[model samples]
Target chain A: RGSLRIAVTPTFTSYFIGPLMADFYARYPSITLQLQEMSQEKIEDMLCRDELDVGIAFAPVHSPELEAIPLLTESLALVVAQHHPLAVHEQVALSRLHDEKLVLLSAEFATREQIDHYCEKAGLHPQVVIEANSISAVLELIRRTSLSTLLPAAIATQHDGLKAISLAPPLLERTAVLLRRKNSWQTAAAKAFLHMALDKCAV
Target chain B: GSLRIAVTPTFTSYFIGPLMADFYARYPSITLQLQEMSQEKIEDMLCRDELDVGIAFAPVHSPELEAIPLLTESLALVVAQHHPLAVHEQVALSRLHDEKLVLLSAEFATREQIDHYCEKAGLHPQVVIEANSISAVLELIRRTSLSTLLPAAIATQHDGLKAISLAPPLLERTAVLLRRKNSWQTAAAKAFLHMALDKCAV
Candidate 1:
């Protein structure tokens, strides 16, 4: 059996693939998997360069040479400690973020780019007090302090001690996709992985 | 004034933000640029004068760098509050031999320390998953029945998890504010050092 080079965004890697790995091993024990944590832009670059066999990243991929298969879609929303005052709100206007102290991902992530774009459109200048590269760190900060953050609704729903408050003008929903360069030679390992990944989401 | 700061992953996750918050408030005029990178890269960048300072594991690997100890931190068994070991005051290393764990990959200095501790204790932990991101590892432990070894502060700081001290305790390391041995420090860098040394010195 050969090896497969795969990359995944931090958020997706944290929440999506862990459960399916056991079944993957059961089906393809002989195939070795090499995984890398990569950003959305780099994932597309590497896939187009033929350096990576497959990757998982948010959609609206930049490279025309690559193809993306839909995995899952979830919208971004305000996440805060369950005890936070804002947690009581069913939904809040995007303008309400002007005064709220928040933490956000750096501009290196596509998620941040989308937030910046939408905030500009809404004419809302969010008070982003901190920027971190790690989603885990952001979540921990949100849970412990009065600070809030913008992250996938599923993240707040699935994590303990955190609550998601819907955005009135919901931050655009993002879709996770399995990305690969078109016309690149496909190894059996890659083929099996892609097939199984799509099937896992199909259910 | 401008300052370039880098921090290792763990420190960035648990400590740097709070420290920076204070530093920013006190020195409002100073422009702060913060980045998270590996300890080795932080050390390398500091030595090359690309970064003004780094908050990383103490006992710098490079002879050209000098470290000012910030705090002493130790690793512990972290589990969800509902996990079986949640009520334990302390846990033995051998108890984890059969327990499934999710851990940070070898890229982290923390992982190397964990492996060394395991080797010394003659305990072979059953690490069922290796994640490159600490957040993933923490989330997995919280969501699933997995346990992990991380800084005690993380478990103590979050409500969903509990930290049980390790018997025959894991090795302790110092968090340090590091810079080049003899490089000229800017007013901003000096101010930061003075503030951090005042607040974080152990």
Candidate 2:
């Protein structure tokens, strides 16, 4: 009754968790929400270890040990500062990004994973001219500099100076997954929290 | 010319944002590459020449870099509006000892500054939670009873939270602009630096 040890990725915490936690804690004040920020692979690692009751992150992996529910799908786009030459375009093709110097998170982040996946699929290897680990850092760099970055749609929308442009042969979207041990008994709170998240995602 | 700039989020003070906006208008040719990190990371970035300049908390002593004081402001405590201490506009040092506090990770300089003050005041705050994300801490303060210390400007920006000023007059922390010692300054970096200094001077 006192706590829920949930592992969350930075992306989820930025967009979905704040408002959900607000409404969640308002109704369930006695149940403390212990949120451990996790990376993509490690989130699942902790979930499998049974150390975390639940997890949220990107998983392009197929593993039967856990039940992965598609929590939300975000369109990833190229982001640049307001002054960038390409910033004038409403949208651009992925091929136009050839040899572009860009800001990217380290490979540990799922956003970078999709960027690499899509770029490699196009036979274009983008250079990481700049590296910023957090979403906000990458966002700030793209907003204020000429460096182009691929970001989750929600993240690009929230930053004032950032320009989010859709890519084509449209870049593969990032799907956030919620994970729990397959066939494991679930707590009442887990069921309710997932329900709340689904409702928000649907809206 | 390109300039890489690093900053701590808290030091993205109200004035600095406006200064950046103005700099863009004056010198759009000067491509500004901005990145935000913890105080420790930003300082290191400045020294390594990975970053041309940085804005952070002052007294960041490193013999390899030079620091220029940009501005000064109070550090304030914040609590949820419904908390026991929410009624006060101002409170003494001892008031924080009784609350469930939240803070950034121990690596942050602001945490150390707050910790030092509390140590002097004989107040040992048992931090109930620690987070590396500044937004997470701000969100927690508004949603939970856990309170935190943040810059006055930042503390005032969030809703459902009340900012309390501490007295008897806490030592003001200066927001400092730092650069590498004996490092070559690009034409664009120097131009932007002066523009930033002009705004801070006021």
Candidate 3:
């Protein structure tokens, strides 16, 4: 019956929360949801300060004051439009992206951070034509133009006209974790929300 | 320099993001503080002098406010590639009465327009889901058969989706940049407003 204050990174919010929210509200009609979208850094910061009851963010939470429970592991993939030349291949080599025009998420996103880290290690300098912060923008640019991006492999599964091609070496897999302050008092609403998240993501 | 800007929730999807990137590129030293909320809240904040500017539909409700028309936009039916209606170039509003759909909440001006259109036509669409986020609505449509109503530009830029024009046409709205009438515009606000005008004036 109490209000549940939750924050999630935009990526996680887009892909995970829709179904979870539908089920959560149906099961707990009295609970009010105070959901906000923020970056992973902000989500962790708010959780540590008690400004938020729960956070859905990437694994390896930066702050030591919070506890994280692994929800799902997502692999990175090369996402391109259906008509792109690389789309004909079920799997693609990372080196093939050297000449491709790319529209990537800005560094504010954990997804972008991981992609940047991999590029540095592999010594691959992609021709990034644009860097946008919103996933919808990135996906739209990719769909309209001959551009490509590296995003969570699962994203393509839920998107139309976008194809996910496996990387030869494959990019690092990141885990989406549910977070809360350590030894913090949990409201009944928060507990129920967590259980629902855990139950839905059990697969 | 810093500017506080608010946009309708749907604008955050594809509109503001690209514009922001371009704005930052042209003015790297200027900091932009962007927030997403309902157009109603945007109006309230501007009226209270809490926000520097807003990107929203035209015809500001408050008499104290003014708007600069940027572009004209109309809503369309967005369906996935495999959906039955995707094959059609256009469809009538009455045809959607039996289709399962996902749409924006009543909080959005777009949803209100949709509801009004349905009311006038006496068509009751089976809205299976109501989401606050445009991307979520698009994703739901992609994964399921639930189509949606969104800016025609949104479906045009998307490869896997099709934008089917309505027979009678949805209400057309003028996209605008909004601010209080005779309000003191900050240097940052002035620059951003002009930049938007230069980019979006049609």
True contacts kept of each: 0.16, 0.07, 0.10
Worst 10 residues of 1 chain B by lDDT: B24-33
Q: What is the lDDT of residue A72 in candidate 2?
A: 83
Per-residue accuracy of model 3 over A1-203 as CA lDDT, tens digit each: 56677778777655687667656655765665555667888989999899999999887788999999989987888889898788899888878778776778777777778888888888888866666556776775667655688887777876678998888887678888999999898998888888989988774
By DockQ, the candidates rank as 1, 2, 3
In candidate 3, position B176 carries an lDDT of: 84
On lDDT, the leading prediction is 1
The full ranking of all candidates by TM-score, starting with the best, is: 2, 1, 3
lDDT of 1 by residue, B32-136 (tens): 567789888999999888999899886789999988878888889989988898989798867878777777878888988989988888888867667677666
Name the TM-score of candidate 2.
0.74
Task: Count backbone clashes in candidate 3.
Answer: 0
Q: After superposition, how far is residue A83 of candidate 1 from its true place, in Å?
A: 7.0
Per-residue lDDT of B157-183 in model 2, one digit per residue for the tens?
A: 445777788876444688888898888
Per-prediction DockQ scores? 0.24, 0.19, 0.12
By lDDT, the better pick of 1 and 3 is: 1
| CA lDDT of every candidate | 0.78, 0.72, 0.77
